[PDB]
Design a protein around this nucleic acid. Sequence first.
RNA 1: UGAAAUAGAACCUGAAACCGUGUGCGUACAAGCAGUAGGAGCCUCAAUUUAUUGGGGUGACUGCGUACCUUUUGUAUAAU
RNA 2: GGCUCAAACUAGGAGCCGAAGCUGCGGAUUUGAAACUUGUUUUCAAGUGGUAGGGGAGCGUUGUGUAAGCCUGUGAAGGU
Lengths: 109, 103, 99, 116, 48
Amino acid sequence: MEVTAKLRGAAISAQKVRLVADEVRGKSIERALDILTYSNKKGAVFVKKCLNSAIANAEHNHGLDIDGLKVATIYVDEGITLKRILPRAKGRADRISKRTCHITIKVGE
Amino acid sequence: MYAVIKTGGKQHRVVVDELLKVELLKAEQGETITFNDVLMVVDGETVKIGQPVVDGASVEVEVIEHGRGEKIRIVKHNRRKHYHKEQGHRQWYTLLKIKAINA
Amino acid sequence: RGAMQCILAELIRQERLILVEELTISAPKTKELIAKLSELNAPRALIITKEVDENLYLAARNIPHVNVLDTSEVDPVSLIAFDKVIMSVEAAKQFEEAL
Amino acid sequence: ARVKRGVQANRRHKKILKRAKGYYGARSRVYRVAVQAVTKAGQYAYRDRRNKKRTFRRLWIARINAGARLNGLSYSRFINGMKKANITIDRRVLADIAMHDAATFGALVEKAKAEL
Amino acid sequence: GLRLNELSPGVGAKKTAQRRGRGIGSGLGKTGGRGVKGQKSRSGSSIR
RNA sequence: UGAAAUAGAACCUGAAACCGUGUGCGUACAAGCAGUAGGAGCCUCAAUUUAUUGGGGUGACUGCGUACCUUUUGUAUAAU
RNA sequence: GGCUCAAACUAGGAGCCGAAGCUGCGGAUUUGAAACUUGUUUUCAAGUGGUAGGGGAGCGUUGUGUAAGCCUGUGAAGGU
């Protein structure tokens, strides 16, 4: 039954973290942890960190057997954007979106 | 057993105990209406065709209830000519049940 | 003047006007006015008569829907608004002269 | 006496977006595109309410032609034979009979051919 | 003598004022009866 | 703890644009203002003495169909 | 596409298709004419494409009186 971990406010774009999330969605925790620890993407540290938090929650707060757990569902949401100014040529300015994301992971049998 | 009858300017092929829809008839709840102008009555292998009507053939029907038609939206619009028009229409209808068919 | 005339006529016609010989409250005290209204069967009323005494004013003002006005200073919005009207014969005569 | 337009504007726009349910892209999501699609949809409905009677008469005529040619006669002669026989059966009923009852349509064609 | 809730001015006593440029259905949309772009359709136009 | 914690401090409510996840149907031989009038199949709720109707979701296939506003003699206009 | 005693042309003849035209059925409405007569009722006749524009009849929103009323924590406004 579904134990949740949330990692609101990651300093990374949701569009980048979604590629990591798609590969661990639905897998067992062991396979997902392996993928995340041998992944070459920055989103993977955040996803592994939230998955580990979820596993710890399911093992401590609810007393579940992590041997039979799975990544029941995972999705990434856009967080708050920090708005910055980028100077360009000829005295013109551009806005810069330093995007963040919220990572939600739910594990269950 | 089936028959071809007229009602509301339209023609209907009907069988016994069929629930039919026709244009609003000024006839009270539950009354019996008899039509002797049926165009054809078919009893199976026997076929009778009126010229233009079949003598001695009558069909009895009853009005279960009167209901308004489903709302229909009507939109007229002339592009660039500053003209739009909107209307809603419901068509009155009466249910008819055929108790029996006589040839 | 004609609007006032019609308002008074329709008040009489629908029995919302009540003539009294006099209405003098002995002392400034709401309960006495309430007792008088109890016998007159007019919980809510507008009282208009020759002159307004301080004691009757002090008794009337506190009451939710009871108000007292002099005959000269009378308004149609008040006459229409308040459900019942208490009015003296002398005030009525002066309304006749005014209108 | 200021009037704020928020609530009424919201309900006005929701009506259009509700009528625009099922449309593609901006047409079912954003009002500027949805409102045109709803008006154009009403125009199409208004025109096809005229056109549907023609289409169904077309279909009835095709089926009656097929039945008459199965029974050895063409549509333009079968209808003429109906009219000479004083048979008032409409094309909708004639097509229904041709499609679902072959023998009765054969009898009708026999009457028409006897009248011709 | 009636209630303040049920007084009426009578038929013909009151007429609703025209408001220009409030849509197609009002009969005064897009122009307020001024026609098309001439001197008389401009804001500060008069009949000298 | 609080009545309430998607009232947890970016904190009353919390719309839309916009962006996710899940379920149902459709889609990799077919050309266009993307709808509309029909319409098979499928899925889902209710009845009904039990695949037949009613409500809802999708829409194979067929017909028709060149946005809105403005300005013009005249616009799908490749005029705004 | 394809068509040659034509599916071309000429002169006839008979059928059918064919529009929002006309007719059939149901409903709305403007004006006018008759009568229980300010929609109180039923009818009849002629109408009811529309830009600029003129005339008529209403919807919704904010506020004031009606209102010390009525509704409302047994759930107002707002949102869906």
